Amino acid sequence: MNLFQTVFTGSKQALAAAEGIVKQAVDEKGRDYKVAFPDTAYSLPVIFAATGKKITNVGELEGALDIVRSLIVEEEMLDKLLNSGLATAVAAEIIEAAKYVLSDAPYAEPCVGFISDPIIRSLGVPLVTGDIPGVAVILGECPDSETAAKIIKDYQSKGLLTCLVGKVIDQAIEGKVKMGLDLRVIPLGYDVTSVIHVVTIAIRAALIFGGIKGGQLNDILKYTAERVPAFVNAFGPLSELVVSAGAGAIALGFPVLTDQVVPEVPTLLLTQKDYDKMVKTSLEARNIKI
Amino acid sequence: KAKSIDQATLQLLDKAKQDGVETVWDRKADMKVQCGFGSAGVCCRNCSMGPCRVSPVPGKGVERGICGATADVIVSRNFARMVAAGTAAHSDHGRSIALSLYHTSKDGDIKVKDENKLKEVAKSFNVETEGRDIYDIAHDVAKEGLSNYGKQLGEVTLPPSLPEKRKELWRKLGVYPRAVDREIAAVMHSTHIGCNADAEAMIKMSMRCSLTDGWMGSFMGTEFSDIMFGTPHSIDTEANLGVLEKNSVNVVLHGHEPLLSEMVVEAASDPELVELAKSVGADGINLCGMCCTGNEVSMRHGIKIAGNFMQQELAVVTGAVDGLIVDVQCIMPALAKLSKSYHTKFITTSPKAHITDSIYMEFDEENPLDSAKKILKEAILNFKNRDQSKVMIPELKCKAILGYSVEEIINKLDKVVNTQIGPMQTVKPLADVLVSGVLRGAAAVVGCNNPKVVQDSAHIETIKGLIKNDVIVVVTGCAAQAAAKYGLLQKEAAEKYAGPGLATVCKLVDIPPVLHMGSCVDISRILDLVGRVANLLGVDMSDLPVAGVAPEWMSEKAVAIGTYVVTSGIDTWLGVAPPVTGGPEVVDILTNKMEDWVGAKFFIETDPHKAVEQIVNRMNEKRKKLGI
Ligand code: SF4
């Protein structure tokens, strides 16, 4: 299975999970039931950026699966791969929205789940200033808790805002990493779809700071690529869904670095086994100056 | 039918009609319906019992020549002789280059300009370098290269980029190359009356001969030219007939051998010659190149390219060419007649290529610079005979970027290498983009023009289709010059013609979507590149999604090139049918059975859009075989 086929398989799995969870939400709560994220002004940010539509009820959430379906075209060209990554991102957002409408408190501490607009505005000032020179999106599991803690604290000591997805949260807790918004170590959630909660940070950064109106998807992608200094460090074995989510990060212009053997793409998808050089490799790949 | 897609070409054809001079198009029209027997390759003249012609349609008419040779035998022998002639042309070019290398000296006209390249080549030839004088090394390297041409005992020396698997496959098949002249002689011997009358064996002998061109003759010529005249790097130039200057002396270098054109370029900066050009009433000296010698001087110095093969006559039709200096190969003899209608001095310089009624000034290899200065002085003095009322230079020229040797490509690829990962100075970024599928493949577009095809149409259509399908294109020769004239050799072309993956790659690496890798002998560079990629991936060259295209080929050299490209394991599309349709067995060998032998085969397709589609499908199926 080559890179394109891996991304397409991951996007289809994300679509299947989104369809299942949306069906569950339709069964339990009804199509008139409200759909929203806590304290946001852009409804579902990824769908709002891609199309301009605001998802307000469960029926509209079910109708948003058509966006995911139309974004998956299985032809081995780079544009289709980027669109398939975006389909995975939209599907992950739909899954997170369904989680919020199904459970009153989908995320428990230390996971924070969705990040509200006021937090985005608070982080915007140090973002453009340079006190936050980048965003380290750490996903998966490191071979040890010690190495995960070392990498996370290296990013933290450099001022980067690091977000954690997956078992790396538990490894960092075992590694005595101090977490919080002021400490710039944000645990999003144990599921892969929780990575969307940092993706919407970038998307809304284009909506708030950039002033790009909803539906101008190319302008949003250009803004995230040229303004948001985010990158992905994917540790541990990578499923097709993880690779598809990484394709979404690449579509947003965010390079993906991993310790796994993957079909490398220069400046976009890079393998770095040496955990002692992962921080420097990511800073170089994202062109970050400390 | 239109004669060309190039507007400057069309304007000069109108001028040639007004001036009452004949062109290659006019002679093609005069030839009318060409002989069917010769077109199918079923005519034989190998002995004076003939001429013999057998039916191109099996089961009808005369079946055998007088000696009993079948249509397949006649076709296979004709094809083999074309391969032998092409191999001879390329090998003679490389032999001259090696002899020039053998005569290099510190204080002479010919020096060593790339010592690192010479040391790497010496490593490839098992020549010691440490603690040695550079010219002693150069002479030893030249001796080894010369031995490759005529050694009768032992094995020849092949470049390290050639995969071990490909060499083992050649040895098992029986096509492993011997000395170049020995293989040419073997082909000529086996086509003699009453020798080889088996099509498969004949084709295998021709493949064996073509390998000595691709991997020994052209390769050594290219690498020694780099050693003596400098490795090409990315450089700007201008292309098409508009580069001629009305108010300057115009000196057009046509041919293939680079030593003469290098010495002419050096002589053009001589203060006495510049002063002489001023004194004859010209603003200066304007050197322009055509065909492969133009490609060489343009790759290494940015000399403007006046035009490719079927434009050579039109260069004279402008009435502005004060001197036309030619060495060997692809020099239309009609030029001698044509220059009578203008003031142009048509100067032959090589004992290998005498042309009747041209001015012969033998280029002296013993004193190359002085000889080049004398020839250039004749061209400059001819400026006084210019008739400015007969001058018409089209205001059509195009910016081009070239100089993409393998070394230059590797240097460009270093830009997209993460320093914390590495390694540097490899083809690894290219291998990565090919394996990931961001690039679907790489295609080489090579070859001449041919009056049978609208000039430059097939080259341009094939190149645009390939780059639109995210296939990166490397170009050589007259195809490269067609791309230069059209405007494809530009960074802007990436966003104008390329597909998404290739546009992203071009933006990241800062290269045009079409890479000009030099002259016809510089096709060896392409081989080198492919080999490196294969050696990096641990596979044979036949496992890669690569292809070669000759949309508008005419020469025996093109036949030899396609043969050795296929024998190396690279599928080749021919835009002009070779004279083999009369032999069904030969057609079946070249287009079907060759894949069993060497993993690649010929594709005959005269429609460029269909050729692009077939190339994409073949690359995709090879990718699926490879798992990428
Ligand atoms: S070699 Fe045979 S087929 Fe050819 S001309 Fe002589 S007799 Fe005829």
PDB file of N, CA and C in Angstrom, chain A residues 1-4 76-82 257 263-268 270-272 274 277 279-286, chain B residues 415-421 424 428-430 432-433 435-438 440 468-470 499-501 504 508 620 623-624 627-628:
ATOM      1  N   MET A   1       0.858  -1.212   0.000  1.00  0.00           N
ATOM      2  CA  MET A   1       0.000   0.000   0.000  1.00  0.00           C
ATOM      3  C   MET A   1       0.879   1.242   0.000  1.00  0.00           C
ATOM      4  N   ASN A   2       0.776   2.036  -1.065  1.00  0.00           N
ATOM      5  CA  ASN A   2       1.597   3.224  -1.220  1.00  0.00           C
ATOM      6  C   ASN A   2       0.988   4.377  -0.416  1.00  0.00           C
ATOM      7  N   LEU A   3       1.618   5.550  -0.494  1.00  0.00           N
ATOM      8  CA  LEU A   3       1.188   6.702   0.296  1.00  0.00           C
ATOM      9  C   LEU A   3      -0.232   7.130  -0.050  1.00  0.00           C
ATOM     10  N   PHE A   4      -0.540   7.229  -1.343  1.00  0.00           N
ATOM     11  CA  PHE A   4      -1.868   7.653  -1.769  1.00  0.00           C
ATOM     12  C   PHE A   4      -2.930   6.683  -1.279  1.00  0.00           C
ATOM     13  N   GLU A  76      -4.447   9.107  -7.985  1.00  0.00           N
ATOM     14  CA  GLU A  76      -3.112   9.291  -7.409  1.00  0.00           C
ATOM     15  C   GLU A  76      -2.440  10.531  -8.004  1.00  0.00           C
ATOM     16  N   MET A  77      -2.946  11.693  -7.579  1.00  0.00           N
ATOM     17  CA  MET A  77      -2.335  12.985  -7.856  1.00  0.00           C
ATOM     18  C   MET A  77      -2.328  13.783  -6.554  1.00  0.00           C
ATOM     19  N   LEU A  78      -1.359  14.693  -6.456  1.00  0.00           N
ATOM     20  CA  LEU A  78      -1.093  15.352  -5.181  1.00  0.00           C
ATOM     21  C   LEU A  78      -2.302  16.134  -4.682  1.00  0.00           C
ATOM     22  N   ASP A  79      -3.012  16.816  -5.583  1.00  0.00           N
ATOM     23  CA  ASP A  79      -4.176  17.597  -5.165  1.00  0.00           C
ATOM     24  C   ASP A  79      -5.244  16.706  -4.534  1.00  0.00           C
ATOM     25  N   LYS A  80      -5.479  15.516  -5.105  1.00  0.00           N
ATOM     26  CA  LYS A  80      -6.446  14.588  -4.517  1.00  0.00           C
ATOM     27  C   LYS A  80      -5.988  14.112  -3.146  1.00  0.00           C
ATOM     28  N   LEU A  81      -4.685  13.897  -2.980  1.00  0.00           N
ATOM     29  CA  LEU A  81      -4.174  13.499  -1.668  1.00  0.00           C
ATOM     30  C   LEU A  81      -4.414  14.592  -0.628  1.00  0.00           C
ATOM     31  N   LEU A  82      -4.163  15.846  -0.991  1.00  0.00           N
ATOM     32  CA  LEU A  82      -4.413  16.950  -0.060  1.00  0.00           C
ATOM     33  C   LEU A  82      -5.907  17.086   0.248  1.00  0.00           C
ATOM     34  N   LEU A 257       6.524  15.048  10.837  1.00  0.00           N
ATOM     35  CA  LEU A 257       7.751  14.327  11.148  1.00  0.00           C
ATOM     36  C   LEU A 257       7.388  13.128  12.008  1.00  0.00           C
ATOM     37  N   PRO A 263       6.767   6.681   3.299  1.00  0.00           N
ATOM     38  CA  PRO A 263       7.231   7.238   2.015  1.00  0.00           C
ATOM     39  C   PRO A 263       7.458   8.736   2.144  1.00  0.00           C
ATOM     40  N   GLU A 264       8.724   9.137   2.215  1.00  0.00           N
ATOM     41  CA  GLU A 264       9.069  10.513   2.539  1.00  0.00           C
ATOM     42  C   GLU A 264       8.747  11.460   1.388  1.00  0.00           C
ATOM     43  N   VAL A 265       8.309  12.662   1.746  1.00  0.00           N
ATOM     44  CA  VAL A 265       8.105  13.766   0.822  1.00  0.00           C
ATOM     45  C   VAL A 265       8.955  14.936   1.315  1.00  0.00           C
ATOM     46  N   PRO A 266       9.915  15.434   0.530  1.00  0.00           N
ATOM     47  CA  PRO A 266      10.806  16.493   1.036  1.00  0.00           C
ATOM     48  C   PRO A 266      10.024  17.702   1.533  1.00  0.00           C
ATOM     49  N   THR A 267      10.454  18.198   2.700  1.00  0.00           N
ATOM     50  CA  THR A 267       9.902  19.360   3.388  1.00  0.00           C
ATOM     51  C   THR A 267       8.483  19.134   3.926  1.00  0.00           C
ATOM     52  N   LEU A 268       7.864  17.988   3.640  1.00  0.00           N
ATOM     53  CA  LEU A 268       6.483  17.744   4.050  1.00  0.00           C
ATOM     54  C   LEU A 268       6.326  16.524   4.945  1.00  0.00           C
ATOM     55  N   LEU A 270       8.662  13.595   6.759  1.00  0.00           N
ATOM     56  CA  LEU A 270      10.052  13.297   7.066  1.00  0.00           C
ATOM     57  C   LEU A 270      10.148  12.252   8.167  1.00  0.00           C
ATOM     58  N   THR A 271      11.112  11.351   8.025  1.00  0.00           N
ATOM     59  CA  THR A 271      11.390  10.332   9.025  1.00  0.00           C
ATOM     60  C   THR A 271      12.651  10.720   9.783  1.00  0.00           C
ATOM     61  N   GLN A 272      12.556  10.742  11.113  1.00  0.00           N
ATOM     62  CA  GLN A 272      13.694  11.029  11.980  1.00  0.00           C
ATOM     63  C   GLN A 272      13.614  10.022  13.123  1.00  0.00           C
ATOM     64  N   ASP A 274      16.140   9.362  15.264  1.00  0.00           N
ATOM     65  CA  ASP A 274      16.909   9.846  16.405  1.00  0.00           C
ATOM     66  C   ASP A 274      16.083  10.823  17.229  1.00  0.00           C
ATOM     67  N   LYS A 277      17.466  14.306  18.094  1.00  0.00           N
ATOM     68  CA  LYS A 277      17.503  15.349  17.077  1.00  0.00           C
ATOM     69  C   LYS A 277      16.124  15.699  16.532  1.00  0.00           C
ATOM     70  N   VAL A 279      13.684  17.507  17.852  1.00  0.00           N
ATOM     71  CA  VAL A 279      13.319  18.907  18.071  1.00  0.00           C
ATOM     72  C   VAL A 279      13.998  19.806  17.041  1.00  0.00           C
ATOM     73  N   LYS A 280      15.310  19.636  16.856  1.00  0.00           N
ATOM     74  CA  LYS A 280      16.036  20.433  15.865  1.00  0.00           C
ATOM     75  C   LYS A 280      15.537  20.148  14.452  1.00  0.00           C
ATOM     76  N   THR A 281      15.244  18.882  14.149  1.00  0.00           N
ATOM     77  CA  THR A 281      14.717  18.539  12.832  1.00  0.00           C
ATOM     78  C   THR A 281      13.397  19.247  12.577  1.00  0.00           C
ATOM     79  N   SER A 282      12.514  19.277  13.578  1.00  0.00           N
ATOM     80  CA  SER A 282      11.227  19.947  13.411  1.00  0.00           C
ATOM     81  C   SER A 282      11.386  21.456  13.289  1.00  0.00           C
ATOM     82  N   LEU A 283      12.276  22.046  14.083  1.00  0.00           N
ATOM     83  CA  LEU A 283      12.494  23.486  13.992  1.00  0.00           C
ATOM     84  C   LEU A 283      13.033  23.864  12.622  1.00  0.00           C
ATOM     85  N   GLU A 284      13.944  23.056  12.080  1.00  0.00           N
ATOM     86  CA  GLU A 284      14.425  23.310  10.728  1.00  0.00           C
ATOM     87  C   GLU A 284      13.329  23.098   9.692  1.00  0.00           C
ATOM     88  N   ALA A 285      12.522  22.046   9.845  1.00  0.00           N
ATOM     89  CA  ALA A 285      11.498  21.738   8.850  1.00  0.00           C
ATOM     90  C   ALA A 285      10.413  22.799   8.819  1.00  0.00           C
ATOM     91  N   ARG A 286      10.097  23.383   9.965  1.00  0.00           N
ATOM     92  CA  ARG A 286       9.114  24.446  10.037  1.00  0.00           C
ATOM     93  C   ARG A 286       9.747  25.831   9.976  1.00  0.00           C
TER      94      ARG A 286
ATOM     95  N   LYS B 415      18.671  21.490  -1.643  1.00  0.00           N
ATOM     96  CA  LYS B 415      17.871  22.537  -1.010  1.00  0.00           C
ATOM     97  C   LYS B 415      16.752  21.949  -0.160  1.00  0.00           C
ATOM     98  N   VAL B 416      16.144  20.850  -0.606  1.00  0.00           N
ATOM     99  CA  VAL B 416      14.993  20.262   0.070  1.00  0.00           C
ATOM    100  C   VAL B 416      15.407  19.138   1.032  1.00  0.00           C
ATOM    101  N   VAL B 417      16.685  19.076   1.410  1.00  0.00           N
ATOM    102  CA  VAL B 417      17.177  18.074   2.351  1.00  0.00           C
ATOM    103  C   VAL B 417      17.215  18.707   3.738  1.00  0.00           C
ATOM    104  N   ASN B 418      16.527  18.092   4.696  1.00  0.00           N
ATOM    105  CA  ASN B 418      16.622  18.540   6.082  1.00  0.00           C
ATOM    106  C   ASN B 418      18.035  18.269   6.588  1.00  0.00           C
ATOM    107  N   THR B 419      18.692  19.310   7.105  1.00  0.00           N
ATOM    108  CA  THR B 419      20.089  19.187   7.515  1.00  0.00           C
ATOM    109  C   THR B 419      20.240  18.173   8.638  1.00  0.00           C
ATOM    110  N   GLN B 420      19.268  18.110   9.549  1.00  0.00           N
ATOM    111  CA  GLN B 420      19.335  17.172  10.666  1.00  0.00           C
ATOM    112  C   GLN B 420      19.098  15.726  10.244  1.00  0.00           C
ATOM    113  N   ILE B 421      18.653  15.476   9.013  1.00  0.00           N
ATOM    114  CA  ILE B 421      18.401  14.123   8.520  1.00  0.00           C
ATOM    115  C   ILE B 421      19.471  13.699   7.520  1.00  0.00           C
ATOM    116  N   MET B 424      23.436  14.535   2.298  1.00  0.00           N
ATOM    117  CA  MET B 424      23.548  15.544   1.262  1.00  0.00           C
ATOM    118  C   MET B 424      24.217  14.946   0.030  1.00  0.00           C
ATOM    119  N   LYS B 428      18.665  11.266  -3.505  1.00  0.00           N
ATOM    120  CA  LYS B 428      17.625  10.787  -2.599  1.00  0.00           C
ATOM    121  C   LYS B 428      16.352  11.625  -2.615  1.00  0.00           C
ATOM    122  N   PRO B 429      16.386  12.964  -2.625  1.00  0.00           N
ATOM    123  CA  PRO B 429      15.105  13.699  -2.724  1.00  0.00           C
ATOM    124  C   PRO B 429      14.296  13.338  -3.967  1.00  0.00           C
ATOM    125  N   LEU B 430      14.960  13.145  -5.108  1.00  0.00           N
ATOM    126  CA  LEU B 430      14.272  12.738  -6.331  1.00  0.00           C
ATOM    127  C   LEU B 430      13.685  11.339  -6.189  1.00  0.00           C
ATOM    128  N   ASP B 432      12.769  10.026  -3.419  1.00  0.00           N
ATOM    129  CA  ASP B 432      11.660  10.156  -2.477  1.00  0.00           C
ATOM    130  C   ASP B 432      10.399  10.662  -3.163  1.00  0.00           C
ATOM    131  N   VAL B 433      10.517  11.699  -3.991  1.00  0.00           N
ATOM    132  CA  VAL B 433       9.314  12.228  -4.649  1.00  0.00           C
ATOM    133  C   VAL B 433       8.746  11.204  -5.637  1.00  0.00           C
ATOM    134  N   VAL B 435       9.052   7.827  -5.304  1.00  0.00           N
ATOM    135  CA  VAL B 435       8.472   6.711  -4.566  1.00  0.00           C
ATOM    136  C   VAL B 435       7.150   7.125  -3.929  1.00  0.00           C
ATOM    137  N   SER B 436       7.087   8.334  -3.356  1.00  0.00           N
ATOM    138  CA  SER B 436       5.856   8.760  -2.698  1.00  0.00           C
ATOM    139  C   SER B 436       4.713   8.947  -3.687  1.00  0.00           C
ATOM    140  N   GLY B 437       5.011   9.140  -4.978  1.00  0.00           N
ATOM    141  CA  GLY B 437       3.953   9.386  -5.936  1.00  0.00           C
ATOM    142  C   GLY B 437       3.625  10.841  -6.170  1.00  0.00           C
ATOM    143  N   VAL B 438       4.321  11.762  -5.502  1.00  0.00           N
ATOM    144  CA  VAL B 438       4.152  13.181  -5.793  1.00  0.00           C
ATOM    145  C   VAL B 438       4.521  13.436  -7.247  1.00  0.00           C
ATOM    146  N   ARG B 440       4.815  11.239 -10.702  1.00  0.00           N
ATOM    147  CA  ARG B 440       4.425   9.950 -11.257  1.00  0.00           C
ATOM    148  C   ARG B 440       5.603   9.253 -11.929  1.00  0.00           C
ATOM    149  N   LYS B 468       2.015  18.010 -17.616  1.00  0.00           N
ATOM    150  CA  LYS B 468       0.663  18.144 -17.091  1.00  0.00           C
ATOM    151  C   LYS B 468       0.275  16.920 -16.264  1.00  0.00           C
ATOM    152  N   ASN B 469       0.801  15.735 -16.604  1.00  0.00           N
ATOM    153  CA  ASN B 469       0.531  14.504 -15.864  1.00  0.00           C
ATOM    154  C   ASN B 469       1.524  14.257 -14.717  1.00  0.00           C
ATOM    155  N   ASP B 470       2.164  15.309 -14.199  1.00  0.00           N
ATOM    156  CA  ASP B 470       3.128  15.202 -13.099  1.00  0.00           C
ATOM    157  C   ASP B 470       4.249  14.215 -13.437  1.00  0.00           C
ATOM    158  N   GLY B 499       1.359  19.865 -13.735  1.00  0.00           N
ATOM    159  CA  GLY B 499       0.312  19.436 -12.835  1.00  0.00           C
ATOM    160  C   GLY B 499       0.655  19.785 -11.400  1.00  0.00           C
ATOM    161  N   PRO B 500      -0.245  19.448 -10.472  1.00  0.00           N
ATOM    162  CA  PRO B 500      -0.038  19.893  -9.069  1.00  0.00           C
ATOM    163  C   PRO B 500       1.232  19.362  -8.418  1.00  0.00           C
ATOM    164  N   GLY B 501       1.505  18.064  -8.528  1.00  0.00           N
ATOM    165  CA  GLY B 501       2.687  17.507  -7.890  1.00  0.00           C
ATOM    166  C   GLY B 501       3.976  18.057  -8.472  1.00  0.00           C
ATOM    167  N   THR B 504       4.431  21.694  -7.388  1.00  0.00           N
ATOM    168  CA  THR B 504       4.955  21.752  -6.028  1.00  0.00           C
ATOM    169  C   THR B 504       6.443  21.419  -6.001  1.00  0.00           C
ATOM    170  N   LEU B 508       9.439  23.919  -4.780  1.00  0.00           N
ATOM    171  CA  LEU B 508      10.316  23.562  -3.663  1.00  0.00           C
ATOM    172  C   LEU B 508      11.784  23.548  -4.066  1.00  0.00           C
ATOM    173  N   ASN B 620       2.321   3.853 -14.631  1.00  0.00           N
ATOM    174  CA  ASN B 620       1.462   3.435 -13.527  1.00  0.00           C
ATOM    175  C   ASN B 620       1.551   1.931 -13.304  1.00  0.00           C
ATOM    176  N   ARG B 623       4.740   1.229 -11.593  1.00  0.00           N
ATOM    177  CA  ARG B 623       4.621   1.615 -10.188  1.00  0.00           C
ATOM    178  C   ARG B 623       3.879   0.554  -9.387  1.00  0.00           C
ATOM    179  N   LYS B 624       2.780   0.035  -9.932  1.00  0.00           N
ATOM    180  CA  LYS B 624       2.028  -1.001  -9.224  1.00  0.00           C
ATOM    181  C   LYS B 624       2.850  -2.271  -9.075  1.00  0.00           C
ATOM    182  N   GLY B 627       5.149  -1.518  -6.212  1.00  0.00           N
ATOM    183  CA  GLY B 627       4.482  -1.289  -4.949  1.00  0.00           C
ATOM    184  C   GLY B 627       4.369   0.163  -4.528  1.00  0.00           C
ATOM    185  N   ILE B 628       4.816   1.105  -5.354  1.00  0.00           N
ATOM    186  CA  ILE B 628       4.731   2.525  -5.012  1.00  0.00           C
ATOM    187  C   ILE B 628       3.484   3.164  -5.626  1.00  0.00           C
TER     188      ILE B 628
END
